[PDB]
Amino acid sequence: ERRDLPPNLYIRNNGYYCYRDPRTGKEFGLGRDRRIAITEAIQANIELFSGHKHKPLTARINSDNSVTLHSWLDRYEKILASRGIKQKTLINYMSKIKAIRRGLPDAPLEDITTKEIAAMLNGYIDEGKAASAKLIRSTLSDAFREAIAEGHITTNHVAATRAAKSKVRRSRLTADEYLKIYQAAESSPCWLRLAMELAVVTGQRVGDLCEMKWSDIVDGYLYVEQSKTGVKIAIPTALHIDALGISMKETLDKCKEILGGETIIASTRREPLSSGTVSRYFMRARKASGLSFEGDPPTFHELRSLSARLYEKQISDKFAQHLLGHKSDTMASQYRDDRGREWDKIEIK
Amino acid sequence: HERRDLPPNLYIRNNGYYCYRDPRTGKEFGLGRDRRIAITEAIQANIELFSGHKHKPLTARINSDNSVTLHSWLDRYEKILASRGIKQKTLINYMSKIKAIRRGLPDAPLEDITTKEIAAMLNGYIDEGKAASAKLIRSTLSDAFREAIAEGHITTNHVAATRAAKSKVRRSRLTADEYLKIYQAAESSPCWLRLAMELAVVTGQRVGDLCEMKWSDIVDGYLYVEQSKTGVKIAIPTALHIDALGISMKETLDKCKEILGGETIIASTRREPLSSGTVSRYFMRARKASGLSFEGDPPTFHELRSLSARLYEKQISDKFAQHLLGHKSDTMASQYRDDRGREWDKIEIK
Amino acid sequence: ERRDLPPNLYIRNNGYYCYRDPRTGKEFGLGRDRRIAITEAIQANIELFSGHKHKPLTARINSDNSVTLHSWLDRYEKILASRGIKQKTLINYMSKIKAIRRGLPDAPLEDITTKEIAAMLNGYIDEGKAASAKLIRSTLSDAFREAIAEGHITTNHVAATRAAKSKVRRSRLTADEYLKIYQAAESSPCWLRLAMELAVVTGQRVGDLCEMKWSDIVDGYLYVEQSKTGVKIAIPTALHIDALGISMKETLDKCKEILGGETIIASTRREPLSSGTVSRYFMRARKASGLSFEGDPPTFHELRSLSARLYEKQISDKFAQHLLGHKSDTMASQYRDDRGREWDKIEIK
Amino acid sequence: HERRDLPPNLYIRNNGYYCYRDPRTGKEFGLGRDRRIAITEAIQANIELFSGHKHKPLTARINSDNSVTLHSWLDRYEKILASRGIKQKTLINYMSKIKAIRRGLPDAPLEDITTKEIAAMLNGYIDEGKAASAKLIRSTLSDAFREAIAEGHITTNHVAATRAAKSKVRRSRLTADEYLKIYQAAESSPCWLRLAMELAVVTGQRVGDLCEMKWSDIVDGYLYVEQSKTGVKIAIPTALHIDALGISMKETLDKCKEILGGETIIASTRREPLSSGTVSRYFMRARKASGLSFEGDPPTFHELRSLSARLYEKQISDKFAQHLLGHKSDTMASQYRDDRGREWDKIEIK
DNA sequence: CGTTCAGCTTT
DNA sequence: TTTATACTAAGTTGGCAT
DNA sequence: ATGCCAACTTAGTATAAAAAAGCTGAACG
DNA sequence: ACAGGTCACTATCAGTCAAAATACC
DNA sequence: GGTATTTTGACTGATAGTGACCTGT
DNA sequence: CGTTCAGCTTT
DNA sequence: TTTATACTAAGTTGGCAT
DNA sequence: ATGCCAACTTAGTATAAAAAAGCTGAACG
DNA sequence: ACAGGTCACTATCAGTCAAAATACC
DNA sequence: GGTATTTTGACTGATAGTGACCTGT
């Protein structure tokens, strides 16, 4: 040749210049102006080294006014702190944000793409953390909605994302399985078995269980104000689960002598238990039982459903619903769900 | 002014450094020394902003029917509301929210009023814990803007993108024991206060309606009430009796006609009709005087109606409570029936 | 002076030229270029004569591609014809369109303003035809939505309009009033009284009433398939309205002898009646009764509500609801509405 | 090419008439003879269109990750659906709708695909009365577009602005008398058809599940069915009996094991399991052979389940019908319970 | 005692 | 025929530190 | 034995604009 | 010594307003 | 006579170039 | 008799 | 506390024409 | 007497995407 | 006679593609 | 040797000026 043509740039028969993106291999037309052609090509080949943009003035102006992701997330945390949400709730959010920080760059909100967000989320889905994905997506979407209401963005680049599937893996618990575990929990601290009984017979959540004080029992009724919902109920000490042969009263007595503390359930040192701990030992006794389940094993919380289902058949739907504290039927008809374990025997009633 | 091919918005520095100046912010931007490139991008940026510079006075015939100011508009919006045909009280609620807007936003051209600005104001209210207000102000702001859009003074409603602040009712409920206790503190107060309290609980009516019951509204064992708030028309049988508080509607009425003596069932010492505000106010006096303590905001006279509902719900029937209160479907009831965290659900083995 | 300055155009101290709209009185800046200034002013003063635009090329291009209101409405009628709607329904729509044709110009859809639409609607509201306004608005909005789904517009300039108030003026009918009318209907053709009885006792709509054939009564049940809803019911001839002393059976007998035709209700010539006619004579007997009502008087249709309300108290809510054919409770709880006439006596039940 | 200050898109005629030519339509526009004015407006119009002409190959780095074609995309969209983890049948339903799209739209760049075009296709289906299809095709089209937006191949979903066509079910219901009549025509058909018909009515199960009941699914007076469609798991008591049709589940099963003899309760003459399509098909044969006439579309084998539901609803209970069918809440039931205009509501004096 | 204005929260 | 939605508040269980 | 952080999966609860009141500190007679 | 850009400050923009000038019933 | 509508020019809050002037390196 | 493919309508 | 929404299908009653 | 058009006010009925089937004319052995 | 604009038709756009040329492990 | 990535130029479906040429007046 006889050319200064820089690489990537070709000249055609008429003298028409074209660039060739080497990543796509598709070319681009420049014109006949070799001076301008080369010029642009140089600037294009410099972008191939590193991605530093001779960014237009337009974009520059839109950007230096508008707000950055991580910066918005700092602000966002402040918004939540003000929603009047419970501490745990805030803890959860913080977590999702933390994830968002790891997953997305700190660039102009307006410049985070649906594609980018999508990529992150699938990242969670491919590790099998579909749940986390759904939640993260949610949080991000809400952070965006807020970015919108304070007028930093204008549209929600997430509203466009694949809101993950919601398959529930934890297996339900059958009465028999309960018994087998109950037995395996022989070599476990005394409070476990008791915890377990108290749980099924009251149908309260582990959190609330572990906070029940003897001073909450007045005239044969156990007063409970549920931490998660604020529902307030009085449970008659006179309950009985005929199917498992559990008596609330009898069980309350064993707790009184064997456990003795201010809290109905207590440690070997007469001190209150962390709900996690209780959950933990149940798990242990469960492994020690050596039972087999499809997918994920039942957990301590599953005693609630077992309670409800057991009181469903022994007493009534309504009782079960009241004992659990569901103002809504959507929830009650969900604890009534067997999740593939049991066959619904159709009665001619 | 010049000796330059320099397009607008681009200034040259003493060294020959070219920068674009955004006119919206007034902050400038660095380009480099390559005037050819500098101007080039400046033109492109000028196209994004001030596309052109010209406006055929024809374009005057366009942007004309457009230019108006928030306050000059609020002024017009008021008159609109005046023709809407709404009750005096409502209009008052509205006018107030407008006023808040007037003190919260600049009198700029509607078109220039930012979502960001609005939210800023709205958040001002939320941060002072006046969330309730924030909602209503937002609500009204949105309505004004709509109307301006109707008259094509704007194209877009910038309020819409903003969200409504959610706010949990604070006000606490009133338990029978508490009522009794308040009633006791009532002894220093006028005779009518007690009678009002009793009547309020037994009849379950709104204080506004209570204050307007006349003796002529009683016929053949029935107290006729046409509710001022909703237009619901009911007749209450003068035979009711609250068991938990030992109140007799007959007896209470009786005490009323002998002691109070006036054209209205409740009446001032001066034997004249009472304002609903006063009934409330005096009750509030008693409540303080009773020294009770509550979570959140303290119960007010309107809480006597919820107590009423709740007691009747048990003594008689849910169905009854509804009818007494004057609730049309099966929905608004499920609200007065609610005790908002004051009661323990005694589980029966049924 | 020493100027050709055209009218409306002033020159300021620096030599700055301004136009003055004479309708607003606000001025407009042109520049220092007297040649251009005048030029533009001329073109502006010519627009003051008539409104003919030296319309830009931009608008010209957007317009000659896009679609016209009346033209869209012609098309629109075709869309409805295809929705599978009943004839009356179509008749109503046609009407609203006709109104739209009278109310709005035949210009580019994209160029009909919220303001213009608004103006029309208020026009109806000020004549006191609030109802019509609501319906028109509706129709127009739907025509627009359709213009949107076939990609002619992009936004619904109506979604922004004041959807009118919906006050219902027609007064309900009390049993007494029924009686007084029933009596006033002495000098009216025999079929009126009968119509009236049959109506209250069956609770069917006038349309359906006037189409009942003797061949629709099998084994003591009156078979009815309601024209407006397609509901199908069988009414026992054994009904009775104790409050008005009406017997369905007795009434059916009088119709058989005195009226005799294929249709249960018939004219003096033994021929079927147009529902309008029946409505008309009721009205007449109503005037002749000389009763006074607040707002609008009751009409024949109000016998339905009276029927329902009467059967509510005599028999049951459920019966009344079934007899009327309401699958929904929203409707039934609406015929239960007294509309300011009667005081709901609270029973201790 | 020229000797002209003429900007692009503006051509001059032999008389000296200037016109702008819209490049999108290709139709030109008249301006006049005033070249100064002509060009002026042409520039303004050129700014609205092709703002500029330049694209820093930097702008290549932008529009690159953008350009893709409907069919090249449908190709990619397929593979996506393949990873979605859906049942074979579903995927099949989807692939079909894609195919319709492939035959209905040009293989143009996504960005260029108009709402107007889409609707045009969609209306094509509606006008042939295939409304049902129109809905589903629309639905899937929308999903594909979303996915492309996710991969930033487009910015906007042009399907969204389009509406879903509403379509009333045509298919008529099956009355007990009709069933009987069809059963009678069945005599020419295989022995299994009748047995299937009976079993279908008595058990109220989906034909797909019927065909897969094995004799081993019966234990201690109970027929266990895990529904293929929904995963619902039920046990049917082999004691049921439809009164209006004189069917005995025991008897019908009995006839089955003696006559049919195969591993499945219903079985082919060849003593092998039957396809659900065939059961349906043969029923359809009978229906024609019976000579009955109906409004709208004729009843099919799946209509035996509605008959089932309806009869049981009366004979036993609404509650029962639900449980038999396998319906979780209190909602999906209120559908099978519906007779869609086949029955007269006998009014009782209750 | 008891009223009207205002700015907030509740039906 | 089934589910979705937008928040909120847990429960589950692996680890590292006492 | 144990206690507390951290990343994940699961329970729980439900509309939003209009319209109309009701509450209560001030200033006032 | 300089990239990068903030900052007060005039000369003109762009236009409002209230008398003076003048047209219309 | 008596009101309404242009001219006209004094008077005023904005803008956009300007060169002086901060500042992190 | 009985199967799979396809294009439509229904759960 | 009450209402909204998006269609669809009537009923109501004034007139002009038989 | 009446019948049919026309402009108005009132009744009536309710989600929309995913997922999974079921129906039935052809061509085929 | 002309406003207003449609219509086929080249010369170049703008770029794809598959060998030739050449660089990289 | 053996694969991958530039050059290069023949080859191709688009576009935008063009003057000839319809048409309602």
List residues of C with catalytic annotation.
205, 228, 301, 304, 326, 335
Across all strands, nucleotide nearest D229 (CA–C1'): L20
User: Does residue C178 contact residue C306 with C-beta atoms inside 8 Å?
Assistant: yes
Three-class secondary structure of residue B28 per DSSP: strand
The encoded tokens of residue D234 equal: 């039920």
* Run of H or E including A9: strand A9-12
| CB-based contacts of B258-265 (< 8 A; 24+ apart in sequence) | B259/B191, B259/B195, B260/B191, B260/B192, B260/B195, B263/B214, B263/B215, B264/B211, B264/B212, B264/B213, B264/B214, B264/B215, B265/B199, B265/B210, B265/B213, B265/B214, B265/B215, B265/B217
Phi first, then psi, for residue C263 (nearest 5°) are -90, 140
Catalytic position from the list B97, B138, B287, B305:
B305
Three-class secondary structure of residue B209 per DSSP: helix
Distance, CA of D278 to CA of D211 (rounded, Å): 10
CATH superfamily of D1-58: Classic Zinc Finger (3.30.160.60)
The DSSP code for D186 is: G
Closest residue (Cα, C1') to H2: B15
Domain B68-168: which CATH number of 1.10.1040.10, 1.10.150.130, 3.10.180.10, 1.10.3210.10 = 1.10.150.130
- Measured CA to CA in angstroms, residue D189 lies from A159, D178, D266, D279, D283 at distances of 55, 17, 14, 11, 9
Distance, CA of C223 to CA of C241 (rounded, Å): 19
Closest CA to A177 of A342, A347, A343: A342
Closest CA to C210 of C269, C277, C257, C260: C277
Vertex B321: Cα angle to B318 and B323 (nearest 5) = 110
User: Does residue B121 contact residue B105 with C-beta atoms inside 8 Å?
Assistant: yes
- For residue B266, count CB atoms less than 10 angstroms from its CB and return exposed for 0-12, middle for 13-18, buried for 19 or more: buried
The encoded tokens of residue B313 equal: 């719900």
* Run of H or E including B30: strand B28-32
Helices (H) then strands (E): counts for chain B:
14, 9
Distance, CA of B101 to CA of B316 (rounded, Å): 48
The encoded tokens of residue D178 equal: 């009709």
Q: Are D1-58 and D68-168 the same fold in CATH?
A: no
- Measured CA to CA in angstroms, residue A171 lies from A125, A341, C256 at distances of 21, 8, 71
Three-class secondary structure of residue D142 per DSSP: helix
User: Does residue D171 contact residue D297 with C-beta atoms inside 8 Å?
Assistant: yes
| Sequence-separated (6 or more) residues with CB below 8 Å from residue B266 | B192, B195, B196, B199, B210, B211, B213, B256, B260, B273, B274, B279
Q: Which amino acid is at A321?
A: Q
Touch between D and C (at least 3 CB pairs under 8 Å): yes
Ranges of H-type helices in A127-214 = 130-149, 175-184, 190-202, 206-209
- Measured CA to CA in angstroms, residue D187 lies from A55, C142, D201, D284, D289 at distances of 82, 54, 18, 14, 10
User: Does residue C273 contact residue C255 with C-beta atoms inside 8 Å?
Assistant: no
Method: X-ray
| Sequence-separated (6 or more) residues with CB below 8 Å from residue A224 | A202, A204, A208, A212, A216, A232, A233, A234, A235
Q: Which residues of D touch C320 (CB under 8 A)?
A: none
Closest CA to A197 of A300, A336, A323, A284: A300
| Sequence-separated (6 or more) residues with CB below 8 Å from residue C132 | C99, C124
Residue with tokens 């889409």: D118
The DSSP code for A254 is: H
D136-160 core/surface letters (b: 16 or more CB in 10 A; e: else):
bbbebbbbbbbbbbbbbbbeebbbe
Top residue of C36, C57, C311 to mutate, by most chain D CBs within 10 Å, is C57
Closest residue (Cα, C1') to F8: A89
Specify whether domain A1-57 bears CATH 3.60.15.10.
no
B20: β partners: B10, B29
Distance from CA of C84 to the nearest CA of B (A): 34
Distance, CA of B8 to CA of B10 (rounded, Å): 6
The encoded tokens of residue C197 equal: 């009885």
The separation, in Å, between residue D18 CA and nucleotide H12 C1' comes to 38
B218: CB within 7 A of chain H nucleic strand: no
State which residues between 219 and 248 of chain C bring their CB within 7 Å of strand L.
228-229, 231
Say what the alpha-carbon torsion angle D79, D80, D84, D89 is, to the nearest 10 degrees: -50
C61-98 core/surface letters (b: 16 or more CB in 10 A; e: else):
beeeebbbbeebbeebeebbeeeeeeeeeeeebeebbe
Architecture of the CATH domain C67-167: Orthogonal Bundle (1.10)
User: Does residue C40 contact residue C82 with C-beta atoms inside 8 Å?
Assistant: no
Q: In chain B, what are the domain boundaries?
A: 1-58, 68-168, 171-349
User: Does residue B245 contact residue B340 with C-beta atoms inside 8 Å?
Assistant: no
A16: β partners: A12
Q: Which regions of chain D does DSSP assign to beta strands (E)? A: 10-12, 18-21, 28-32, 218-219, 222-226, 233-237, 241-242, 247-248, 345-346
Top residue of B151, B153, B226, B319 to mutate, by most chain C CBs within 10 Å, is B151
Give the count of beta carbons closer than 10 Å to the beta carbon of residue C235: 25
Distance, CA of C199 to CA of C275 (rounded, Å): 12
Distance, CA of C45 to CA of B48 (rounded, Å): 31
The DSSP code for D275 is: P
Checking DSSP bridges between strand D18-21 and strand D28-32, what pairing results, if any? antiparallel
The encoded tokens of residue B303 equal: 């809480």
Distance, CA of B73 to CA of D161 (rounded, Å): 33
Three-class secondary structure of residue D34 per DSSP: coil
Say what the alpha-carbon torsion angle C92, C98, C99, C103 is, to the nearest 10 degrees: 160
Architecture of the CATH domain B171-349: Orthogonal Bundle (1.10)
User: Domain spanning C170-348: which CATH class is it, in words?
Assistant: mainly alpha
Vertex A156: Cα angle to A151 and A157 (nearest 5) = 130
Side by side, which strands form the sheet with B28-32? B10-12, B18-21, B28-32
Vertex D147: Cα angle to D146 and D149 (nearest 5) = 65
User: Does residue C162 contact residue C118 with C-beta atoms inside 8 Å?
Assistant: yes
Give the count of beta carbons closer than 10 Å to the beta carbon of residue C301: 17
Distance, CA of B194 to CA of C132 (rounded, Å): 53
Residue with tokens 């958040």: B123
* 3 state SS for chain C: CCCCCCCCEEEECCCEEEEECCCCCCEEEEECCHHHHHHHHHHHHHHHHHCCCCCCHHHHHHHHHCCEHHHHHHHHHHHHHCCCCCHHHHHHHHHHHHHHHHHCCCCEHHHCCHHHHHHHHHHHHHCCCHHHHHHHHHHHHHHHHHHHHCCCCCCCCCCCCCCCCCCCCECCCCHHHHHHHHHHCCCCCHHHHHHHHHHHHHCCCHHHHCCCEHHHEECCEEEEECCCCCCEEEEECCCEECCCCEEHHHHHHHHHHHHCCCECCCCCCCCCCCHHHHHHHHHHHHHHHCCCCCCECCCCCHHHHHHHHHHHHHCCHHHHHHHHCCCCHHHHHHHCCCCCCCCEECCCC
Residues of B with a Cβ under 8 Å from any C Cβ are 55-58, 60-61, 64, 85, 146, 149-152, 222, 224, 231-237, 239-240, 316-317, 319-320, 323-324, 328-329
C191-212 core/surface letters (b: 16 or more CB in 10 A; e: else):
bbbbbbbbbbbbbbbbbbbbbb
CA C240 to chain centre: 35
CA B271 to chain centre: 35
User: Does residue A152 contact residue A139 with C-beta atoms inside 8 Å?
Assistant: no
Choose among A28, A54, A346: nearest Cβ to D237.
Answer: A346
Residue with tokens 């959807």: C163
Closest CA to B144 of B65, B64, B84: B84
B235-250 core/surface letters (b: 16 or more CB in 10 A; e: else):
bbebebebebbebbbe
Residue with tokens 């690489």: A7
